[PDB]
Amino acid sequence: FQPTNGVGYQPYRVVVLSFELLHAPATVCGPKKSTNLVKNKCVNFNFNGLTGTGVLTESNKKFLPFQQFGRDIADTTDAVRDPQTLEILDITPCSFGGVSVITPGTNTSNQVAVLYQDVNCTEVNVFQTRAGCLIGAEHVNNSYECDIPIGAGICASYQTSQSIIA
Amino acid sequence: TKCTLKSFTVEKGIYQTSNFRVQPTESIVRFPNITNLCPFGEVFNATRF
Amino acid sequence: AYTNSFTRGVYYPDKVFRSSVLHSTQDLFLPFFSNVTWFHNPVLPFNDGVYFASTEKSNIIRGWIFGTTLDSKTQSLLIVNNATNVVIKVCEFQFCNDPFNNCTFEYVSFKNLREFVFKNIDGYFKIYSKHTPINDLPQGFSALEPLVDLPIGINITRFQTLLAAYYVGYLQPRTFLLKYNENGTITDAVDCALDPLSE
Ligand SMILES: *[C@@H]1O[C@H](CO)[C@@H](O)[C@H](O)[C@H]1NC(C)=O
Ligand SMILES: *[C@@H]1O[C@H](CO)[C@@H](O)[C@H](O)[C@H]1NC(C)=O
Numbered sequence: 001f002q003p004t005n006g007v008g009y010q011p012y013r014v015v016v017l018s019f020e021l022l023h024a025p026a027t028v029c030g031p032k033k034s035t036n037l038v039k040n041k042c043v044n045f046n047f048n049g050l051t052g053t054g055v056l057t058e059s060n061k062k063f064l065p066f067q068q069f070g071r072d073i074a075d076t077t078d079a080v081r082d083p084q085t086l087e088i089l090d091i092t093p094c095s096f097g098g099v100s101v102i103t104p105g106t107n108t109s110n111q112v113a114v115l116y117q118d119v120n121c122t123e124v125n126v127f128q129t130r131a132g133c134l135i136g137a138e139h140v141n142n143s144y145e146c147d148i149p150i151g152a153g154i155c156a157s158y159q160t161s162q163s164i165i166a
Numbered sequence: 167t168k169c170t171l172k173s174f175t176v177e178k179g180i181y182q183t184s185n186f187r188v189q190p191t192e193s194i195v196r197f198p199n200i201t202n203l204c205p206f207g208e209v210f211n212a213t214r215f
Numbered sequence: 216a217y218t219n220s221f222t223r224g225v226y227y228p229d230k231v232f233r234s235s236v237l238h239s240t241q242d243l244f245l246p247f248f249s250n251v252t253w254f255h256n257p258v259l260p261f262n263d264g265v266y267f268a269s270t271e272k273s274n275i276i277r278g279w280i281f282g283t284t285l286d287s288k289t290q291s292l293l294i295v296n297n298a299t300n301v302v303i304k305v306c307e308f309q310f311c312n313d314p315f316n317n318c319t320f321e322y323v324s325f326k327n328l329r330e331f332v333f334k335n336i337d338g339y340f341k342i343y344s345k346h347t348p349i350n351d352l353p354q355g356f357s358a359l360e361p362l363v364d365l366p367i368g369i370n371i372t373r374f375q376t377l378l379a380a381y382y383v384g385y386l387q388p389r390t391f392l393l394k395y396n397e398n399g400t401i402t403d404a405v406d407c408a409l410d411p412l413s414e
């Protein structure tokens with residue numbers, strides 16, 4: 001070995017990594033991906049082991065120093081301990097529901113008002129009630145007999161130029 | 167409403183047609199602080215082979 | 216000799232947290248009111264688990280020995296507390312017939328009751344524990360919090376003991392009913408096959 005030969009006789013260092021695999025837990029593994037944390041949005045998470053979709057929010061449950069998950073009476077995931085900073089989050093399924101088209105007689109008018117059931121419609125003139133939130137209906141402080149029942153004591157009707165009142 | 171009722175006129179009432187569903191914004195992944203990396207700097211950077 | 220383990224030997228079977236809810240889980244547990252082979256040294260079998268207990272004063276009980284043939288030509292675990300740290304190996308150190316080499320793992324870090332539990336689930340090691348002060352196995356209830364895990368996959372059938380009193384149980388596949396309190400702590404359990412009232 002001389003430093004002024006050609007490359008042909010010029011020394012080279014060689015390392016041969018022989019990857020062997022048996023029925024083993026196989027701990028020798030590369031780094032996994034890790035994204036930043038976002039709350040209060042219907043996101044599609046995958047914490048350390050488990051996955052799912054929900055709306056992560058900061059919580060106030062107190063896990064035991066070795067526990068990781070949480071579950072309900074019906075065996076559903078409810079809380080996760082964040083593996084990087086150990087703060088417990090909650091998990092709320094981002095909202096869903098049904099769409100219902102209120103109409104007066106078509107004979108009477110072509111105007112309607114929609115009721116999204118059981119949402120806050122802050123992420124979905126615009127009225128929030130106890131049964132959903134009503135879109136396209138005035139609010140009156142009076143009271144009359146029920147014309148079109150809705151739920152939880154709200155009845156809407158068509159009244160005076162005219163419009164729909166609730 | 168008309169298309170669900172199979173009618174061109176509908177009498178006064180309340181009817182249910184479709185379904186609401188918020189969609190997932192994005193994905194998120196979390197894992198423990200990756201430390202204790204391989205001492206590959208010990209076999210590649212070694213003194214004597 | 217023999218004695219009767221009244222109510223002891225319940226370990227959190229998993230990692231979830233449940234608050235004030237009665238749960239029914241099936242796994243390997245020590246049957247209620249069993250016999251424990253009171254001792255005061257020789258090898259023993261490893262049917263499906265153990266309930267090593269002890270009531271020591273000055274750490275007279277040190278460690279353990281595992282393995283199938285318990286010497287060379289087949290691997291064998293080890294655990295010791297040699298006044299420094301819990302040295303763990305899976306080497307084939309010639310096992311002396313009265314104790315007190317090509318290996319593929321390593322690690323280095325009456326008033327006591329060092330209750331322990333050992334399981335070779337999927338051939339890999341699993342340990343629980345609970346270290347309780349006391350002042351001849353007392354009654355009373357206390358759960359076991361897991362503290363270690365070894366991914367070895369060794370084939371274990373027999374074990375031994377190194378060098379007060381200590382006992383030995385054997386886990387069996389029995390269904391229980393666990394009473395998580397509000398904090399998530401196991402507070403009471405009912406054996407689901409002991410007797411008609413329990414059923
Ligand atoms: C209903 O429709 C008929 C014709 O289709 C019409 O003569 C009648 O006035 C309508 N009544 C109301 C209350 O709209
Ligand atoms: C709608 O959302 C806002 C912000 O998240 C919240 O402050 C408000 O209380 C919600 N509405 C209801 C009726 O809870």
Ligand SMILES: *[C@@H]1O[C@H](CO)[C@@H](O)[C@H](O)[C@H]1NC(C)=O
Pocket residue numbers: 217218219249250
């Ligand atoms: C187990 O315990 C019972 C009650 O203490 C005793 O009668 C019996 O001899 C013990 N051993 C066996 C093998 O049953």
Ligand SMILES: *[C@@H]1O[C@H](CO)[C@@H](O)[C@H](O)[C@H]1NC(C)=O
Pocket residue numbers: 316317
């Ligand atoms: C493991 O090493 C020992 C000597 O330390 C040797 O006798 C044995 O053959 C080796 N095992 C294998 C599978 O090579």
Ligand SMILES: *[C@@H]1O[C@H](CO)[C@@H](O)[C@H](O)[C@H]1NC(C)=O
Pocket residue numbers: 338368369370
């Ligand atoms: C251990 O031996 C049993 C039979 O005695 C066999 O079923 C099992 O696969 C063996 N495990 C290992 C890890 O060699």
Ligand SMILES: *[C@@H]1O[C@H](CO)[C@@H](O)[C@H](O)[C@H]1NC(C)=O
Pocket residue numbers: 398
């Ligand atoms: C629950 O945890 C709190 C927090 O330390 C503690 O003060 C309390 O004694 C524990 N047990 C109960 C039953 O509240």
